[PDB]
Amino acid sequence: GRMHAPGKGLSQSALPYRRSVPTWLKLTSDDVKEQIYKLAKKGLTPSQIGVILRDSHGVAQVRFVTGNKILRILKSKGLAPDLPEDLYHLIKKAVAVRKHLERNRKDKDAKFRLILIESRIHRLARYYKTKRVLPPNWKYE
Amino acid sequence: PLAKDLLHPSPEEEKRKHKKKRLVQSPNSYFMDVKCPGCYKITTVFSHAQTVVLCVGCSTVLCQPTGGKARLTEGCSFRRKQ
Amino acid sequence: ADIQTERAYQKQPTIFQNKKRVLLGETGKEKLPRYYKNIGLGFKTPKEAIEGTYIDKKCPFTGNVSIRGRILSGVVTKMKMQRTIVIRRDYLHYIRKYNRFEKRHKNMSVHLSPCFRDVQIGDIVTVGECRPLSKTVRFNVLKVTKA
Amino acid sequence: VRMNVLADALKSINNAEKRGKRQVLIRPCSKVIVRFLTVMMKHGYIGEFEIIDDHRAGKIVVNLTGRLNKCGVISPRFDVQLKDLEKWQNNLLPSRQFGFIVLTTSAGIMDHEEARRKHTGGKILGFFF
Amino acid sequence: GKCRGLRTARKLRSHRRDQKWHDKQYKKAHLGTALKANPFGGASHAKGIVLEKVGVEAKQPNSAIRKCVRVQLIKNGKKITAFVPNDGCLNFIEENDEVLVAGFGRKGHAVGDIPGVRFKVVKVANVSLLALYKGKKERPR
RNA sequence: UUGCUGCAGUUAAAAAGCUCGUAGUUGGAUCUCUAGCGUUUACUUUGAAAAAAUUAGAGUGUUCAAAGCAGGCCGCCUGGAUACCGCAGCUAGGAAUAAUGGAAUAGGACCGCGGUUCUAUUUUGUUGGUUUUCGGAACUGAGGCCAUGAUUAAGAGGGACGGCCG
RNA sequence: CGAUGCGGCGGCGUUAUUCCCAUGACCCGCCGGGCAGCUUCCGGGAAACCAAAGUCUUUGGGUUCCGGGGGGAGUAUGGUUGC
């Protein structure tokens, strides 16, 4: 089921068997790379970049056409962000809830949900410190 | 019950059954090409799409983001690719 | 001096450092002959030991310590003493009633020769048994392997 | 979450056979399951099976003959010696005439009778009769 | 649910070890609290001096006067009530005699009829009551 | 009726009011040798080491037996065996199973190539002074090659976005 | 097995936004996750009953808390928290 919820939701992406590039795809590996770079400069997230490239330009899977993933391409050049996507998003959700809580002292629900977010930050931070993508002195405030 | 070929299910039963609980996984989504009424240039869009997409040819909205599949604008004709 | 920290003079007891030298060799350069021995059980003596200027009577390469008995390993847990480190040894004790194991650790103080420089916490170290050196130290660091 | 995939695989086969289904679906598929099923087939309990290969992690579809009484997993993987094997085949098997304990040994995954023949201990995976 | 893991020997041993205290027999045995409270102090038989003869009434369903003796022990010098066994054995006992008493049979608990007695008289004045009952001996005068 | 094998917990005695969480335990597919090695263990099989007595057990008519270590043949031919000995520590095979890592701002592997310092203690029959190479190291300025280097994306999990819902 | 709540997917025909589509309200199916219900000799249980309280002598998926005849007793004492 979920991390911090009783729901057993089964809703994710089902990537097809055929890894083969579609015959109708005109864009080449280098052309896609140039597109990813141009998108990345506008200040976007690998998630958003992948969605925009899937919707607009008709690239089913970047890793199939190029042979490398979005964060990996941006890492290889050096247009990758300092904090990983998911940790950054948890921190901005945490500070948003804390900003709400600072006015509302009675909102017990907000306090409970903050505790649940903080737990996700710490559990993800520990993993990133284990893989040595963050420094070992990295704390949360 | 008791005799079904789990190996070779009938293709209509295969399509009905959930995308993740199929014998071999395949997405229900597809890639389709759009022909805008006030333009000559062709564009490709994802069946369940999430961003309002723009045709830079005439600078007009094509498909709308919805709960499921993206609703195309009136006049713009969609056709299945492979 | 660089090597001279204490109240008494530090010097290798085998080495004599007051030979009669003539001016052609005196004014040329200054270098004391450094004593080192090869410990037996296929352990190469580190270059920093045969080249270094450190003075340590408990170094197995450049001191009066003969390595004999058991050769064990351990992981470094505390480097917070003078030329000695606390290492941890993890093992599984088999309980036959249940037919299951329980993990147990032993922390032993080992002497770390000042040759082994820029050695960090967490890496594995192979230690050799020697005569007792302090109250609790009976083992001497022979070689380091990085994590 | 899922731990010891073999446990789910053997439990699935057991329930299917008790219910009287002529085929059973196992997911996911690992070498350990394939070798275990191979040992079960070699002695003539299941017969032919197919490995449906998707790119993620395979599924097995097993033809079931009405022969298998029980197929159990032993968790955790206990350390079994030649001297202790009498005790195990005395405890788990229903008779000394038939039934087999499947050990993973340095030689490979194999039944207890072959383990005695080739003279090597290992880890107990499961039993069937 | 029981933990079955290969490295759970400590958990199982710890649990089994502390859960044995909830057993009535083990706790009464191993904890040195029964022994000091036991009038004999873990001795099969004990010797005492008679205070007085006493008639203890039986339980509700069947009425009778059970003949007994109040005896003060030799080792710890505390008072107990002992039940004389066979018919007319009370006649052979007199006040202020030396008497060997044994446990009744039910491991220091009561009897079917006679309430609040643990002990029974086996010897009187260094002579077995069976011998005085069967007339194989006579009370030393 | 203390349950590791092997017990219970809706009503018989029993699941914390509820969620988070460190230690603890458990953890998804996937990779077919050049006197030094090979990535290191756990596991398993073999070997030496391990006091007798005891226990199992060979031989032996104590008159039988529990025993004992004696005895048997007409000066002789005998016996006083053998096995087990948790764990851990030594020793040599196996490599299924289970942990661990070998190259990701390439100071990565493998090949021949430029130089700085020092040294081996053979050499100009032996002997004193300079310069050497060979034997052997760290530091580097480049070059060629790798089919050059990232398995999959769990009906595991986090996060993103879309239109709702209460 | 028929309903139901939220979302998605496909499809005759009624209606409203005049009409065409396109959105609502219905109608008939499907898929996933929830609140449940009816039926059943799957199988359990001492039974009452339970599609879990099933897959248990054909006994091992992972892990936490926890009971050991009835009273004494959630009592006495000690510790700790609180005005």
Side-chain angles (χ1 to χ4, degrees):
Chain A
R2 292 287 83 73
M3 187 96 90
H4 302 141
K8 311 306 193 303
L10 184 67
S11 61
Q12 65 267 51
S13 292
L15 200 68
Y17 187 96
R18 280 183 61 267
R19 296 156 166 179
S20 305
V21 168
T23 190
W24 54 262
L25 186 65
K26 311 312 301 181
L27 299 190
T28 64
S29 175
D30 293 19
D31 204 340
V32 178
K33 279 198 181 71
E34 300 324 303
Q35 268 284 10
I36 295 297
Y37 286 125
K38 283 181 73 175
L39 265 290
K41 300 323 183 63
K42 300 202 283 182
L44 296 172
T45 310
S47 284
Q48 288 182 329
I49 294 159
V51 167
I52 291 163
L53 200 80
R54 191 199 58 227
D55 291 7
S56 304
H57 305 283
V59 172
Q61 189 68 30
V62 61
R63 190 260 319 289
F64 285 3
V65 296
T66 63
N68 233 13
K69 295 182 283 295
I70 299 294
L71 181 61
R72 201 77 63 71
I73 292 300
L74 298 185
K75 271 293 290 159
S76 74
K77 178 57 185 293
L79 266 290
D82 200 339
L83 282 80
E85 162 186 332
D86 44 8
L87 188 58
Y88 178 98
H89 280 114
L90 283 169
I91 296 285
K92 82 179 287 296
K93 189 176 285 184
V95 71
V97 168
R98 189 166 282 186
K99 183 200 134 285
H100 172 239
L101 268 161
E102 85 201 339
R103 284 198 308 282
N104 301 293
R105 283 277 164 278
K106 299 292 291 187
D107 198 310
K108 305 309 179 60
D109 182 61
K111 194 168 190 169
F112 179 85
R113 296 288 170 188
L114 182 57
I115 294 295
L116 260 55
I117 295 156
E118 302 295 45
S119 298
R120 261 168 285 156
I121 282 93
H122 287 121
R123 284 178 69 173
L124 196 63
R126 188 163 73 243
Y127 159 71
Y128 282 136
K129 290 157 77 81
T130 299
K131 300 300 293 179
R132 297 185 287 92
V133 72
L134 300 176
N137 55 60
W138 194 89
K139 297 202 168 285
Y140 168 75
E141 68 289 340
Chain B
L2 290 81
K4 319 320 315 182
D5 148 47
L6 300 168
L7 273 162
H8 314 99
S10 60
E12 74 286 353
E13 178 263 14
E14 292 273 40
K15 185 65 193 170
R16 189 185 56 230
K17 184 144 53 54
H18 184 235
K19 69 173 190 168
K20 217 74 180 175
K21 305 188 182 172
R22 267 202 265 283
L23 190 63
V24 293
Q25 279 169 77
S26 57
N28 298 330
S29 64
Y30 49 87
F31 277 102
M32 60 189 180
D33 49 12
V34 177
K35 173 54 182 194
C36 192
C39 192
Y40 64 86
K41 186 165 203 306
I42 313 306
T43 189
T44 178
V45 297
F46 189 55
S47 56
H48 299 60
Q50 318 204 354
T51 164
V52 169
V53 82
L54 279 303
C55 52
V56 295
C58 65
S59 304
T60 307
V61 54
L62 293 170
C63 63
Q64 291 291 347
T66 322
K69 295 164 71 164
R71 297 173 61 266
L72 299 103
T73 53
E74 299 282 17
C76 298
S77 57
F78 69 93
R79 166 170 153 188
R80 192 76 71 79
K81 204 163 282 282
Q82 63 167 24
Chain C
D2 189 9
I3 292 169
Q4 297 290 18
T5 63
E6 304 298 351
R7 296 274 284 284
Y9 194 71
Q10 305 288 352
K11 48 173 278 280
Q12 294 188 308
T14 50
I15 298 304
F16 181 54
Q17 60 173 238
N18 272 292
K19 273 296 307 308
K20 272 184 162 177
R21 271 309 321 156
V22 185
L23 271 292
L24 80 161
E26 290 276 27
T27 58
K29 61 97 186 175
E30 304 88 27
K31 197 263 168 185
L32 298 173
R34 175 47 162 263
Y35 156 75
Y36 65 89
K37 66 168 181 294
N38 176 233
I39 63 170
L41 303 184
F43 291 110
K44 276 69 68 171
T45 66
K47 195 194 298 193
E48 55 250 38
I50 70 161
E51 295 285 64
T53 320
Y54 70 86
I55 301 177
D56 176 35
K57 71 188 178 172
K58 297 179 177 180
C59 164
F61 306 111
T62 74
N64 196 249
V65 171
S66 57
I67 303 304
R68 77 290 174 282
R70 292 150 180 282
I71 308 301
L72 305 171
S73 72
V75 62
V76 181
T77 65
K78 281 193 296 300
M79 301 180 63
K80 289 155 54 52
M81 292 183 285
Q82 307 202 250
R83 305 177 153 185
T84 170
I85 66 177
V86 175
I87 70 174
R88 167 159 176 169
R89 280 165 45 75
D90 301 280
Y91 58 96
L92 297 172
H93 186 255
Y94 179 78
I95 306 300
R96 197 185 71 205
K97 174 164 164 68
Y98 300 94
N99 309 109
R100 275 74 177 277
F101 298 87
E102 67 192 58
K103 78 156 312 319
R104 302 193 197 180
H105 83 306
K106 293 265 193 171
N107 294 348
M108 49 168 64
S109 302
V110 303
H111 184 82
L112 178 61
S113 178
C115 54
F116 295 114
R117 277 149 47 260
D118 212 319
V119 63
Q120 298 299 319
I121 193 175
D123 59 11
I124 205 80
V125 52
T126 314
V127 302
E129 173 163 28
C130 64
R131 64 172 190 76
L133 299 178
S134 77
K135 187 181 184 298
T136 67
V137 174
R138 287 91 173 79
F139 282 94
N140 217 329
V141 167
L142 297 195
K143 75 173 290 185
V144 170
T145 299
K146 215 65 63 183
Chain D
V1 292
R2 188 164 314 122
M3 306 173 186
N4 195 291
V5 62
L6 182 63
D8 299 345
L10 290 198
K11 188 66 74 69
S12 288
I13 293 167
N14 190 198
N15 290 330
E17 184 54 40
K18 279 208 299 297
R19 208 70 167 77
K21 300 261 285 193
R22 300 174 192 283
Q23 304 188 338
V24 62
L25 177 56
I26 301 160
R27 52 165 292 281
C29 174
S30 58
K31 290 169 306 199
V32 170
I33 296 170
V34 169
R35 296 307 188 87
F36 197 101
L37 260 61
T38 304
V39 167
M40 284 186 83
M41 188 184 75
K42 281 291 207 304
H43 295 241
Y45 275 81
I46 57 173
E48 293 202 339
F49 57 92
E50 190 94 58
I51 301 171
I52 294 170
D53 174 46
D54 59 331
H55 287 299
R56 302 129 169 75
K59 308 177 172 168
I60 304 174
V61 285
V62 185
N63 294 287
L64 292 173
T65 62
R67 286 175 167 176
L68 187 65
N69 286 297
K70 185 61 165 176
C71 56
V73 72
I74 302 297
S75 194
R77 310 289 184 76
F78 278 56
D79 307 320
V80 177
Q81 293 183 347
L82 272 295
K83 69 201 289 163
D84 285 6
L85 188 59
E86 277 106 317
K87 195 186 66 53
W88 276 104
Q89 77 185 49
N90 187 21
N91 223 306
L92 288 174
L93 270 66
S95 168
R96 294 225 298 165
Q97 304 300 334
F98 69 105
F100 302 102
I101 289 157
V102 176
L103 299 175
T104 181
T105 78
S106 70
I109 300 159
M110 59 201 196
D111 61 82
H112 78 274
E113 299 285 11
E114 188 165 276
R116 285 214 180 285
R117 191 170 307 104
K118 294 211 299 196
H119 188 72
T120 183
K123 318 288 194 66
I124 192 166
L125 298 188
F127 62 96
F128 68 96
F129 54 85
Chain E
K2 295 151 50 162
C3 46
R4 293 166 174 284
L6 275 171
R7 295 170 44 156
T8 66
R10 170 156 33 259
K11 193 73 208 295
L12 292 161
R13 187 150 60 88
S14 296
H15 187 245
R16 178 55 52 240
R17 177 256 283 170
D18 70 47
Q19 283 297 348
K20 274 165 72 183
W21 291 118
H22 293 109
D23 196 345
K24 63 215 188 284
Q25 279 99 8
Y26 180 84
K27 185 153 187 68
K28 191 199 58 45
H30 279 66
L31 177 60
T33 187
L35 195 149
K36 66 193 57 153
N38 188 0
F40 296 164
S44 61
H45 299 73
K47 200 175 285 180
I49 306 299
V50 174
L51 298 193
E52 58 190 40
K53 298 169 180 182
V54 55
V56 182
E57 291 91 320
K59 282 317 201 309
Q60 303 204 29
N62 64 279
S63 175
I65 314 302
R66 309 296 169 193
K67 306 307 188 304
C68 292
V69 165
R70 277 200 153 284
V71 61
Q72 192 175 335
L73 300 175
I74 300 291
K75 61 184 122 197
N76 49 2
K78 60 175 65 170
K79 280 82 76 171
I80 60 167
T81 305
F83 166 73
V84 303
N86 287 309
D87 187 284
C89 290
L90 195 72
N91 296 309
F92 287 88
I93 298 168
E94 295 294 342
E95 285 92 326
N96 193 67
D97 293 354
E98 201 164 14
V99 168
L100 186 74
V101 299
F104 190 85
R106 269 199 64 184
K107 204 62 54 176
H109 285 317
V111 191
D113 281 341
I114 187 160
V117 303
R118 304 158 163 284
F119 317 115
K120 52 183 279 282
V121 176
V122 58
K123 287 184 163 183
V124 175
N126 208 59
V127 177
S128 177
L129 275 185
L130 191 144
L132 298 180
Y133 183 65
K134 289 213 170 173
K136 301 196 172 198
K137 272 167 165 62
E138 64 199 339
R139 185 149 78 78
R141 291 276 82 186

